[PDB]
Amino acid sequence: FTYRGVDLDQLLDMSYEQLMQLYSARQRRRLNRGLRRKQHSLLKRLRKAKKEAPPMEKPEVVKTHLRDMIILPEMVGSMVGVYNGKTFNQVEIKPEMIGHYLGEFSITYKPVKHGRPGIG
Amino acid sequence: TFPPASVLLFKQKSNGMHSLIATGHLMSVDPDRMVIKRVVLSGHPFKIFTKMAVVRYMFFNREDVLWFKPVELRTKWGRRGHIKEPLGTHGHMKCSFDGKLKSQDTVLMNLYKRVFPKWTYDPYVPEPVPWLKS
Amino acid sequence: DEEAEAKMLEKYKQERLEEMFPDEVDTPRDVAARIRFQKYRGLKSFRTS
Amino acid sequence: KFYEQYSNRLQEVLNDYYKEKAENCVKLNT
Amino acid sequence: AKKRKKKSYTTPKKNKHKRKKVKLAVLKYYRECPSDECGAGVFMASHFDRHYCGKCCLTYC
RNA sequence: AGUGGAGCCUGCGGCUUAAUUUGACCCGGCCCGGACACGGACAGGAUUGACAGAUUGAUAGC
Ligand SMILES: [Zn+2]
Numbered sequence: 001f002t003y004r005g006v007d008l009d010q011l012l013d014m015s016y017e018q019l020m021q022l023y024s025a026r027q028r029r030r031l032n033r034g035l036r037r038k039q040h041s042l043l044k045r046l047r048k049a050k051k052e053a054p055p056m057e058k059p060e061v062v063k064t065h066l067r068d069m070i071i072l073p074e075m076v077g078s079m080v081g082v083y084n085g086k087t088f089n090q091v092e093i094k095p096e097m098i099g100h101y102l103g104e105f106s107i108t109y110k111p112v113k114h115g116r117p118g119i120g
Numbered sequence: 121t122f123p124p125a126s127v128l129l130f131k132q133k134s135n136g137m138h139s140l141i142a143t144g145h146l147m148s149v150d151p152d153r154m155v156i157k158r159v160v161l162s163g164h165p166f167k168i169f170t171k172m173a174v175v176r177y178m179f180f181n182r183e184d185v186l187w188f189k190p191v192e193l194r195t196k197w198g199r200r201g202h203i204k205e206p207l208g209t210h211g212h213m214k215c216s217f218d219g220k221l222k223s224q225d226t227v228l229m230n231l232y233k234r235v236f237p238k239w240t241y242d243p244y245v246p247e248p249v250p251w252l253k254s
Numbered sequence: 255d256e257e258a259e260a261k262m263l264e265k266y267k268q269e270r271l272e273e274m275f276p277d278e279v280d281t282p283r284d285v286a287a288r289i290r291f292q293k294y295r296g297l298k299s300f301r302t303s
Numbered sequence: 304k305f306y307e308q309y310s311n312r313l314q315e316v317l318n319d320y321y322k323e324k325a326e327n328c329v330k331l332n333t
Numbered sequence: 334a335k336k337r338k339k340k341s342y343t344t345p346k347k348n349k350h351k352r353k354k355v356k357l358a359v360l361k362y363y364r365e366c367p368s369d370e371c372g373a374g375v376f377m378a379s380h381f382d383r384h385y386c387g388k389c390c391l392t393y394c
Numbered sequence: 395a396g397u398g399g400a401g402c403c404u405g406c407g408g409c410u411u412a413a414u415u416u417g418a419c420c421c422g423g424c425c426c427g428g429a430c431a432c433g434g435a436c437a438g439g440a441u442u443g444a445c446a447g448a449u450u451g452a453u454a455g456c
Contacts (some may be wrong), residue, residue: 016333034330037453065451083451086412086421112410120408158277159294161287162338170417179285179341183411187288191296196335208420209412226337228278231294279341315392323453349426350456357438378445385445394447 001095003073008095011073024099027070042066046078063088067103084108121146136249157235162228168221170203170212177226179211183190188229192218196226366391 020028025060053059063081076095081088089106158254165179179185184205194203201217281287298302337350365379371388378385
């Protein structure tokens with residue numbers, strides 16, 4: 001696995017001011033604006049859940065309402081459930097979801113399967 | 121029994137007193153006479169627009185409304201309408217009516233099933249005590 | 255002894271309730287109405303349906 | 304009684320307010 | 334007019350939280366607050382590390 | 395000059411939906427909701443207010 005030609009271990013060692021040379025434009029604008037209190041709260045919650053877990057076992061899920069959250073490369077391996085307005089969806093953070101928001105992993109609408117039309 | 125025949129209905133009161141509760145006569149014998157028990161379910165129309173309302177407290181699931189969709193709803197003040205859609209996950213429903221409903225009003229529908237008598241016939245009947253007022 | 259009188263006053267209350275409101279049943283919140291009223295149906299007209 | 308009727312601490316609260324107002328987004332912690 | 338049935342539907346609201354009652358807490362007083370107004374009368378409550386005020390909320394170490 | 399044909403956009407029906415608000419809606423969660431009478435508790439505190447830390451989706455001294 002590699003992301004812009006960078007291996008994940010270097011990404012784990014990749015400094016915060018120099019990840020602003022590596023993401024897309026929207027992600028870099030967000031991290032230059034900085035994360036608010038709730039996103040760091042989720043970060044600390046995920047770090048606690050990953051740290052306080054058996055090594056052979058997947059970590060315990062963390063439920064959240066945060067969909068504005070951008071996936072940092074620290075989170076790979078954490079097991080996160082995210083609300084879509086009605087139901088939590090349980091998702092594993094993969095290596096290939098560094099450049100993605102959480103909210104696009106829980107779809108907030110159901111696909112349209114058209115029924116027979118009424119009187120129009 | 122072939123009519124004409126008198127009919128008396130008594131109740132076992134207490135300590136052997138048969139209290140006469142009812143009287144009449146025997147009409148024609150048939151098990152073809154349908155007896156229909158009615159249940160009337162009532163709900164409160166709490167969002168009233170013109171000729172359409174949103175009603176609650178009458179069902180409590182989403183598919184409860186879908187099961188009893190084909191039944192016509194009526195109204196305590198004489199209106200007549202029907203269910204369109206359930207909106208909430210709970211039993212909230214959209215109902216279209218003939219005229220505009222009052223906020224004071226009540227929606228209700230009737231459900232029907234044929235009820236049959238219980239086989240509980242026994243020819244033995246206790247001898248009464250002599251009767252007296254209570 | 256008093257349980258018979260309790261059912262007596264209950265029957266009094268049920269009789270007074272089924273003349274103010276002739277056949278009204280509060281739908282149960284715990285049992286689904288399609289199951290508790292499973293054998294029931296709606297007639298368009300009690301005369302002609 | 305009815306008809307006859309008619310600093311350092313503020314600076315500490317100020318700096319606590321400024322700390323919390325900077326703490327809604329810190330942008331630095333890793 | 335036409336009257337409504339008034340459904341019952343009992344829902345138990347009895348289990349509501351009440352804060353714990355400390356009985357005769359005047360035993361443990363006998364730090365004094367050197368404040369502008371609440372001096373010489375008010376006792377100055379103890380944590381595990383630091384004592385906090387119950388009237389003016391001053392900050393110490 | 396066009397529109398009606400075409401791609402896109404918007405409106406109204408219709409269709410899906412938990413909701414697709416309407417000529418504000420949906421999914422969860424904390425809080426409390428009268429007087430008066432009766433029965434308890436209260437000065438051997440009724441109850442308010444409260445800095446820090448832990449909570450659940452929320453910096454909930456509710
Ligand atoms: Zn204080």
